[PDB]
Swiss-Prot record, chain A:
Signal peptide: none annotated. The chain holds residues 1 to 191 of 377 of the full protein. This is 26S proteasome non-ATPase regulatory subunit 4. GO terms for cellular component: cytosol; nucleoplasm; nucleus; proteasome accessory complex; proteasome complex; proteasome regulatory particle, base subcomplex. The lineage of its organism: Eukaryota, Metazoa, Chordata, Craniata, Vertebrata. Belongs to the proteasome subunit S5A family. It comes from Homo sapiens. One of its GO terms (molecular function) is polyubiquitin modification-dependent protein binding. Component of the 26S proteasome, a multiprotein complex involved in the ATP-dependent degradation of ubiquitinated proteins. This complex plays a key role in the maintenance of protein homeostasis by removing misfolded or damaged proteins, which could impair cellular functions, and by removing proteins whose functions are no longer required. Therefore, the proteasome participates in numerous cellular processes, including cell cycle progression, apoptosis, or DNA damage repair. There is a cross-link at residue 122 (Glycyl lysine isopeptide (Lys-Gly) (interchain with G-Cter in SUMO2)).
From Swiss-Prot, chain B:
This is 26S proteasome non-ATPase regulatory subunit 14. It is an enzyme of class 3 (hydrolase). It comes from Homo sapiens. SUPFAM superfamilies: JAB1/MPN domain. GO terms for cellular component: cytosol; cytosolic proteasome complex; extracellular region; ficolin-1-rich granule lumen; nucleoplasm; nucleus; proteasome accessory complex; proteasome complex. The gene is PSMD14. One of its GO terms (molecular function) is metal ion binding. Keywords: DNA damage, DNA repair, Hydrolase, Metal-binding, Metalloprotease, Phosphoprotein, Protease, Proteasome, Ubl conjugation pathway, Zinc. CDD domains: MPN_RPN11_CSN5. A motif (JAMM motif) lies at residues 90-103. It holds the Pfam family RPN11_C. The modification Phosphoserine is found at residues 127, 201.
UniProtKB/Swiss-Prot annotation, chain D:
Transmembrane segments: none annotated. This is 26S proteasome non-ATPase regulatory subunit 13. Component of the 19S proteasome regulatory particle complex. The 26S proteasome consists of a 20S core particle (CP) and two 19S regulatory subunits (RP). The regulatory particle is made of a lid composed of 9 subunits including PSMD13, a base containing 6 ATPases and few additional components. Component of the 26S proteasome, a multiprotein complex involved in the ATP-dependent degradation of ubiquitinated proteins. This complex plays a key role in the maintenance of protein homeostasis by removing misfolded or damaged proteins, which could impair cellular functions, and by removing proteins whose functions are no longer required. Therefore, the proteasome participates in numerous cellular processes, including cell cycle progression, apoptosis, or DNA damage repair. The modification N6-acetyllysine is found at residue 16. The gene is PSMD13. Belongs to the proteasome subunit S11 family. It comes from the Eukaryota.
Curated annotation (Swiss-Prot), chain G:
The chain holds residues 71 to 140 of 418 of the full protein. The gene is PSMC4. It comes from the Eukaryota. It comes from Homo sapiens (Human). It is found in: Cytoplasm; Nucleus. Belongs to the AAA ATPase family. Component of the 26S proteasome, a multiprotein complex involved in the ATP-dependent degradation of ubiquitinated proteins. This complex plays a key role in the maintenance of protein homeostasis by removing misfolded or damaged proteins, which could impair cellular functions, and by removing proteins whose functions are no longer required. Therefore, the proteasome participates in numerous cellular processes, including cell cycle progression, apoptosis, or DNA damage repair. Component of the 19S proteasome regulatory particle complex. The 26S proteasome consists of a 20S core particle (CP) and two 19S regulatory subunits (RP). The regulatory particle is made of a lid composed of 9 subunits, a base containing 6 ATPases including PSMC4 and few additional components. Interacts with NR1I3. Interacts with PAAF1. Interacts with TRIM5. Interacts with ZFAND1. This is 26S proteasome regulatory subunit 6B.
Amino acid sequence: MVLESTMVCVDNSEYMRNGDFLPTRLQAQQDAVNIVCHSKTRSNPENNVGLITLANDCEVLTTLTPDTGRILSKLHTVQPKGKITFCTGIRVAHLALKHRQGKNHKMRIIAFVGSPVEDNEKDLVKLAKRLKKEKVNVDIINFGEEEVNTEKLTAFVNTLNGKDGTGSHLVTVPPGPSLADALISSPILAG
Amino acid sequence: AVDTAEQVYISSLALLKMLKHGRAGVPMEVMGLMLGEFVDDYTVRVIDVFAMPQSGTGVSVEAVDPVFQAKMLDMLKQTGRPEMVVGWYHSHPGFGCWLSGVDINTQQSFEALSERAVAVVVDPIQSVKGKVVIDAFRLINANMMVLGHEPRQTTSNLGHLNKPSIQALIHGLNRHYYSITINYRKNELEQKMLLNLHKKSWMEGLTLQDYSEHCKHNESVVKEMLELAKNYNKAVEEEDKMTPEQLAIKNVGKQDPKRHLEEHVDVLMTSNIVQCLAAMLDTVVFK
Amino acid sequence: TKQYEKSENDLKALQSVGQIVGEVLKQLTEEKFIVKATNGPRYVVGCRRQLDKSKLKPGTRVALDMTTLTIMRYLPREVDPLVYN
Amino acid sequence: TRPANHRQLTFEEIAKSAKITVNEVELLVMKALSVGLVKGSIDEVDKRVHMTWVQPRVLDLQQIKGMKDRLEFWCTDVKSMEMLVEHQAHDILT
Amino acid sequence: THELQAMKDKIKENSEKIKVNKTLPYLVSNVIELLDVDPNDSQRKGKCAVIKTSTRQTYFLPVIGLVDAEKLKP
Amino acid sequence: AVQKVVVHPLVLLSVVDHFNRIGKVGNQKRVVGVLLGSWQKKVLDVSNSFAVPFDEDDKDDSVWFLDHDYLENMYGMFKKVNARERIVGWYHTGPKLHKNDIAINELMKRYCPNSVLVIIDVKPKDLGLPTEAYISVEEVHDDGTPTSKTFEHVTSEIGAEEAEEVGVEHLLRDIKDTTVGTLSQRITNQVHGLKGLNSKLLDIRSYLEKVATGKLPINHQIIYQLQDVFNLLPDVSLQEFVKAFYLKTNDQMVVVYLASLIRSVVALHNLINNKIANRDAEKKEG
Amino acid sequence: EFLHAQEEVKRIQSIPLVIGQFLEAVDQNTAIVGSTTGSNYYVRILSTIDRELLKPNASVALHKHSNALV
Ligand SMILES: [Zn+2]
């Protein structure tokens, strides 16, 4: 199977507590963690997946482990109130990826951005060239309400990698009512 | 096949885990394992030492837990250096650290798996400070009864290892077993700082505090022990003035001297602490 | 489930070996006290740091360590037959 | 304030500064002993007041400077004298 | 709420160590029982017990370990 | 709370040998591990420890993580083999703690009620007894600010018990021991004195440098009270300090009087007996 | 270094030392003694004190390991 370590990032920003995604984004992104942890389980047994809180202070409560049980426990009562913070959210998972015992696993990060961010374009392009030097491939899936047809995030994924690098894909929520399972139905079949 | 004089390069961390794992089990004998790397036949090194848990079967070949070895080596893989296992060791705090019947009963298993698997024993009891103590053992091959039992060549470390000849019951194991030499490799920087670490005892705690604590007491209440020292003056020297007259009666030395020598000269060395540290007051009080 | 682990943590106190009974016979210095085992060997050991010899006295039923044989704990009075008569 | 100590004062100093009668300077200084700012004792023969210790309050960069002067003097004191001590016995050590 | 089975696993592993270290009955012995606690002269807690042996010896031990003062008088 | 800690040479080396572990691969940052303490009483003692791989980004200088599975099952390993050992905190090699080291203790406060972090030093240079000890405590402030954690310094001392004494006491093989009464006290007069000179010198150099550069605060708070504590005692005579002078002279009377007494006794015995056995051996043989 | 050796022999040994039931001194530097467990022994005595305080009948503290005459 493919060798890599996937680090899932839940969105704890205060804008993620609304029930626009049925029944609530808390359970919606919980099912999103359910489908990414079960797919990586069906992908390779050697994949270890932790969680990271992006907004406010960034702390990983569950050390990187192949078992998602403790991750599912932290999905409940997470108290996702705070202001979204982007620039640190990728690097905090990058440090968790440098603590891996085995060096044969590729560095992989999946994050959810459900809130408008104040991150400047200079900061995301500095992280883009930094990830170019660090080879890390990040697959982001945009939830929630944000700038219509997100650009700085799309340009972030574009300028993140190149040639090929097969790759970083960005999935933005369509402007219409839908279930969270329908939003994650596309990435699970094809990245 | 080929046999040559052997030398065990040890790390201070190995010896620390040795005596630490042996001190926590006193009197009961514990069971550890030796960790290191085999470079060649005539030289060997132990770069790490870890301890095995104590079980109900006591010290036995079954006491080694396989799932403990799998999880430890996994914890060594996430540790900086995951070196392969080499040999075993067990402490003997209660006696002269000689191999028992169970020690060889696990030795044919450690020589089965591992080619060498040098057995080491350590005890705290023998010397509190100035001796290596510990021990060394290696099982000679019983299949060598055909050929001769008396190697090695370059007898330097061999003839120097045999001495003292280590008693009788220990060198009673010299039949079917033989010791191995141990030297301390530097690593001088850590050896020097850890040298000063224990020197904090007799020098001072911080190299400042304890003799600034000698500036705390500083004759205090240190004259009380001078009053007991001057009571040792009166006591010892009132029978010291009876000695030279008796020397004239018995004509002369009975060999002797009673000693009844030196002593309070050291009290006068504390008087050097009196004059010096009190002369510091002129520096302390003025500016 | 939790009470079973409490009995497990109970057993985490039981690996510590029990000391040896002793009778303090007399004393010599603050580090040396005449003591004998129930089987007859006489020793002189040091005490622990909590006690005063007023808590010991000569001719006192006590206990010693299993290695250092140091004076640690004690009880003044014991016997088998008394109450069972 | 005084370099002192020279920590023994007189009744004229307290009674003139505090402009209070000589009978109330007892209550004055001894209440300060109860406040805890000074542990000193009062000599009532000449009616003198002997202070002990002091209560530090505030004190300035000029004081950090003179503090380096009081320090560096202690530095060269111990350095000189102690380097003279073992200057004598450095030979015999070897 | 799912850690009860994990605690059941740690009490099965440690009671497996109670299967290897009970610690096994082998040598026959006899008892002497008492209750004690240590004030000083800081404050601590505990209890002690006494024992006989098959070799005639006697020992001073913190309270058993494994079964308790439940039974019996010696 | 925690007053003083006893740091054995075993735990210090257990950090430094791991500084060889990740030091051969380098590069930056520090060696961080979990500290295994032993608490018999208010005085804290340390016996063993273990180190965990740790990395800290600078970007993001506040990001830190440890392996809890390593802390969990190895604690299950070390508690198994030794039931007396438990984790009292963590440690790092410093040399000076960055502001991010607080949250590490706040994460492991679930393991131990009070976690004491021990800064250590792998390369001995200055000024004295190595390492350091900081206890996690909330002191708030006299300024009534929202409660923040500034770790209070715990005095650290080096000690051992039995076997840990055996190893190092044989490993010295360096300087005379002690020797009691002659070189010991006077070399300590050099070290404690001179290292006390450059201590407060460089520390008073920081006193003025912090006022020159680094403001704010900086100065306030403790500056005015601490510096006045320096101005507590100048402290010279007159008067009673003059009485202490010749009283101290009256103190040296007895000891030097006794010195002359030992001189007469040592000279009497040794000289008389030696000349006896000397003149006798010469007149009998010659 | 000889003063250091004096610190060794004065540190040697124990603390704690088992006292034993002494019978007689057979000849130079050695003697026979029963322990407090009642078994006669043959041991070379401690060097610095040969005789004066040993006496025919006393109770001599015997080395922990060796049961040496001290
Ligand atoms: Zn054995």
